[PDB]
Design a protein around this ligand. Structure first.
Ligand SMILES: [Cu+2]
Ligand SMILES: [Cu+2]
Ligand SMILES: [Cu+2]
Ligand SMILES: [Cu+2]
Ligand SMILES: [Cu+2]
Lengths: 72, 278
């Protein structure tokens, strides 16, 4: 049962999420994310640090990136 | 081959380790280790096939991956072995590990860039090629995203767990493997990745040479656990979908099983590893 979609500007960058199991984009570039058995999430730029939701993983990625473009 | 605590290396052993790592990087071989790790960590999932992570084979998989890397180092300089970082003892930014003659220090505050040591971007010798974003320089933020490394008492609580692993054999499991990996409990191995920050906190974490020293100590803790629990062994032992059973082979090598990797002494010993005792 998938999380809801989201779309917002976070620290100046557009973050979007949508069910697909779930896709996240940072300024239109896909951010790979993964769901853990307990329902938390990680992303490929925070792969050892569970956060509760795909939006939390998108925000953590924007924090980690410090303005840098994501690579596809 | 003896794997030694990084804190104990001589100046000549640090010099030789660094030079062998930099030659694997120059020749293009190093980056393929980064790529292999990222491919597995991105495909290992709690609900499907899982080999390198979030699964019982997390420990033999990283043991074989580290053996591949150590053999590549030895092809450059046969005297080099992988040292290990006991992060429960060497737990501050002041540890000699992070000195300019070894791994260099933390990243500067503006962009996380490591500014000293042999792997600093300014040397021209450590381009970050296998990456998830535009930045091509090594980054760290020691103690930035999580305040403390595990302590020895926390490690000892994990080492006291008797079962190797438990159904459902994933990040939800009770048992030693998942507590060492860190998805449940006081969190050992995942928290160290988070504590270093930079690339070490991402799927392309072998971009930081500390990756190997972290995993060599995780590997030593599996050896310590076996000494503590000579009566316990790898599970599962057959017919488990999506999970590598004891006698099944592991990707990417396909020609090795967890059973072939349980006894490290067939490949290396440690400077110190206590015998079984009570
Ligand atoms: Cu890993
Ligand atoms: Cu790891
Ligand atoms: Cu003996
Ligand atoms: Cu006994
Ligand atoms: Cu004892």
């Amino acid at each position: 049962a998938a999380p809801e979609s989201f779309d917002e500007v976070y620290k100046g960058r557009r973050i979007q999420g949508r069910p697909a199991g779930y896709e996240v984009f940072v300024d239109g570039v896909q951010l790979q994310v993964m769901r853990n058995a307990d329902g938390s999430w990680i992303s490929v730029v925070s792969h050892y640090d569970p956060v509760p939701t795909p939006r939390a993983a998108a925000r953590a990625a924007v924090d980690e990136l410090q303005g840098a473009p994501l690579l596809p | 081959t003896v794997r030694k605590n990084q804190a104990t290396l001589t100046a000549d052993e640090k010099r030789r380790f660094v030079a062998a790592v930099l030659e694997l990087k120059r020749s293009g071989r190093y980056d393929e280790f980064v790529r292999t790790h990222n491919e597995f960590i991105m495909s290992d999932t709690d609900s499907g096939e899982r080999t390198g992570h979030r699964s019982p084979s997390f420990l033999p998989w990283h043991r074989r991956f580290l053996l591949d890397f150590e053999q590549a180092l030895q092809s450059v300089d046969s005297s080099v072995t992988l040292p290990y970082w006991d992060w429960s003892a060497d737990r501050t930014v002041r540890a000699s590990l992070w000195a300019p003659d070894f791994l260099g220090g933390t990243g500067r505050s503006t962009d996380g860039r490591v500014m000293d040591g042999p792997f600093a971007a300014s040397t021209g010798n450590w381009p970050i090629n296998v990456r998830v974003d535009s930045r091509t320089y090594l980054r760290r933020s020691l103690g930035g995203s999580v305040a403390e490394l595990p302590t020895r008492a926390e490690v000892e609580s994990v080492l006291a767990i008797s079962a190797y692993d438990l159904p459902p054999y994933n990040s939800a499991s009770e048992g030693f493997r998942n507590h060492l990996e860190g998805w449940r409990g006081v969190n050992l191995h995942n928290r160290v990745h988070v504590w270093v920050g930079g690339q070490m906190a991402t799927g392309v974490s072998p971009n930081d040479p500390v990756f190997w020293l972290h995993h060599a100590y995780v590997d030593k803790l599996w050896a310590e656990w076996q000494r503590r629990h000579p009566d316990s062994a790898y599970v599962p032992t057959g017919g488990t979908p999506d999970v590598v059973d004891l006698n099944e082979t592991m990707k990417p090598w396909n020609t090795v099983r967890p059973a072939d990797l349980l006894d490290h002494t067939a490949y290396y010993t440690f400077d110190a590893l206590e015998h079984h005792h009570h």
